Ligand binder design. Structure first.
Ligand SMILES: Cc1cc2nc3c(=O)[nH]c(=O)nc-3n(C[C@H](O)[C@H](O)[C@H](O)COP(=O)(O)OP(=O)(O)OC[C@H]3O[C@@H](n4cnc5c(N)ncnc54)[C@H](O)[C@@H]3O)c2cc1C
Ligand SMILES: Cc1cc2nc3c(=O)[nH]c(=O)nc-3n(C[C@H](O)[C@H](O)[C@H](O)COP(=O)(O)OP(=O)(O)OC[C@H]3O[C@@H](n4cnc5c(N)ncnc54)[C@H](O)[C@@H]3O)c2cc1C
Lengths: 340, 340
């Protein structure tokens, strides 16, 4: 069975690894290749801080809540492992701040120690009257892509740098199954008017006294259009930009100033922090993830496709449950191939 | 009024600064000098990680609970200030772990967000069945001594390196008031059989993914004779040694191995952490702090003394309330000097 995974961000690499681990067998070996136009450190996944946190609103597809919890439980089970440093995986606590009262999120029982903030805690944040505290996990995107890449490479998965122009192009080279993990660019291989870029910009700063994340919200202005601060292993991410429809892969000074001034109002100690770097990326925004099989006609043959794209601002948070779901769909293909 | 403060750890410098700020006036200037045998980075204060946390047991003198709370409230009021980075001051959350249930500490309402740990949190710690989570503050000892030293120096307080052999020696040089802030060595200037060294040893390690403190307890073996892990700004402190009566200022390999093996059992990710440094210091253990006035006969004159020593494993935690108390005692001296 020749499988091609298109895409080498967290979704494509985790899906490739899950297909291999579940379905590369002694009596049915797979040949798996990854085709991608960009690899680490140059994907969207590489821009993400990697905090596990779904959106505040309930997902349109309720299975996505399961996939996020599966990812959390999976990662939590390994956070105290000696492997965790190579994954970029660690525990972190922090604040979610609101102007006024809001209902609890659906994921409040997935994270550890979820509670409302107390009055004395809220006194630390002059602009916010309500919020949460909990403990979650960070899975840093660059690190984890590097780790996934090493695991794939040691299992014989080969990687090729190319921009694919069509599913037919890949089918003509002999793929029996294509897994489409192309993030925000999926529309170029098959039009999808529900998929749009949600452009974000972040700054990385040296602020090693910051031991908590701090996410603020202004839901009417949209998720992530409010300051956020997320300590990583080496540096702290500052952000708070979400611009639907904007395809400019270029840091801009207006968004720089929005991020800096908003995060320094939130946390005045950041005025002393050295700015290390700045990045832009495109969240693959869709009303729900597209995670589903399709049969495509590709010249003289049909080809099986699994789509796995549209993970918005939560691709690291949900990737493992999606990758397991994609591998289940792959097993349905194999079961049907026996019954030819 | 000529004042000599003996001692340049956190107690002596904070007391000197509080006396200056409260009682150096236009119509009554003070001349304040600090005499010390060791200055930063070579004091006990420099060895301390600086987590605000009193002992678990209630203090013999209940005023000490007030002094600790005053210190916490003072520091918390400045933690989001642009001055905080120069003090070495930041917020941190973390765990206190026990084998079995224990009553809540008296300071549970001083810290932020105090709660019992949940079952799923306790599942992360195989050896512990009970514990707490809260948010506290770190005030790093070296940094804060440097900061106190700059504040004193800009106010004209002069520092002299010397070992003082007696209070009479200092009185003969013309001191009207001596403030005795000599930590564990106070017994050399006036015998105090209740004051003893509580020797500790720590290791500093590069583990920047550690965002929480983790303190374990085995109360029958004594406070701090159980593993602890405390992230600082740059490095993580590992410890867990408290040896009453031991005056050896020398890191030893047996205590090294106790610390390392106990902290790596607590947190297996530390097995990958690079060891940076190792230090020994002496906690000034006393059944209560000695914070009180004495009149001493010093040859032809009497001299006023304020004692401020005996702060055990909590000198950073309590220092500001003690320093304010010492300055109140200093004001009683001035009031009596008017009534000569
Ligand atoms: C500023 C920002 C912060 C974020 N923070 C977080 C966070 O803290 N937590 C969280 O859960 N998520 C976060 N996210 C979201 C997360 O980054 C995305 O959901 C996730 O990276 C999407 O992964 P992906 O693999 O689908 O896409 P990508 O990482 O973009 O990978 C897509 C791959 O497809 C390839 N490709 C596309 N089209 C073609 C083609 N035609 N031919 C060949 N290759 C092709 C690309 O080259 C690339 O290899 C953040 C995103 C942004 C922008
Ligand atoms: C391993 C360890 C970890 C700790 N962690 C923490 C923590 O996280 N939080 C917390 O609250 N506390 C902590 N502590 C406790 C804290 O370090 C002490 O309580 C505090 O430093 C005592 O301060 P001090 O100024 O009295 O003593 P010191 O810092 O020892 O200063 C005493 C001064 O007196 C001088 N001196 C003494 N005798 C003479 C003399 N005859 N002539 C001249 N000078 C003299 C010395 O040279 C020195 O300048 C820790 C202590 C240890 C050992």
């Amino acid at each position: 069975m020749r499988v091609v995974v298109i895409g080498a961000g967290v979704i494509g690499l985790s899906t490739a690894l899950c297909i291999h681990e579940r379905y590369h067998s002694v009596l049915q070996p797979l040949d798996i290749k990854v085709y991608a136009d960009r690899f680490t450190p140059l994907t969207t996944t590489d821009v993400a801080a990697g905090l596990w946190q779904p959106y505040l609103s309930d997902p349109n597809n309720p299975q996505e809540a399961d996939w996020s919890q599966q990812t959390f439980d999976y990662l939590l089970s390994h956070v105290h492992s000696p492997n965790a440093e190579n994954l970029g995986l660690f525990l972190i606590s922090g604040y979610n701040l609101f102007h006024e009262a809001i209902p609890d999120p659906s994921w409040k029982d997935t994270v550890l120690g979820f509670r409302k903030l107390t009055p004395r805690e809220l006194d630390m944040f002059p602009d916010y009257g309500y919020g949460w505290f909990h403990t979650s996990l960070i899975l840093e995107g660059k690190n984890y892509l590097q780790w996934l890449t090493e695991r794939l490479t040691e299992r014989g998965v080969k990687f090729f740098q190319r921009k694919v122009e069509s599913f037919e192009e890949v089918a003509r080279e002999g793929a029996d199954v294509i897994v489409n993990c192309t993030g925000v660019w999926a529309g170029a291989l098959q039009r999808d008017p529900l998929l749009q870029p949600g452009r974000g910009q972040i700054m990385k700063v040296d602020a090693p006294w910051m031991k908590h994340f701090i996410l603020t919200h202004d839901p009417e202005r949209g998720i992530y259009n409010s300051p956020y601060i997320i300590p990583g292993t080496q540096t702290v991410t500052l952000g708070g930009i979400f611009q639907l429809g904007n395809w400019s892969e270029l840091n801009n000074i207006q968004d720089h100033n929005t991020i800096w001034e908003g995060c320094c109002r939130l946390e005045p100690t950041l005025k002393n922090a050295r700015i290390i770097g700045e990045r832009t990326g495109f969240r693959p925004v869709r009303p729900q993830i597209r995670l589903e099989r399709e049969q495509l006609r590709t010249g003289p043959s049909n080809t099986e496709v699994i789509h796995n794209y549209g993970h918005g601002g939560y691709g690291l948070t949900i990737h493992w449950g999606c990758a397991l779901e994609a591998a289940k769909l792959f097993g349905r293909i194999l079961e049907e191939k026996k019954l030819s």
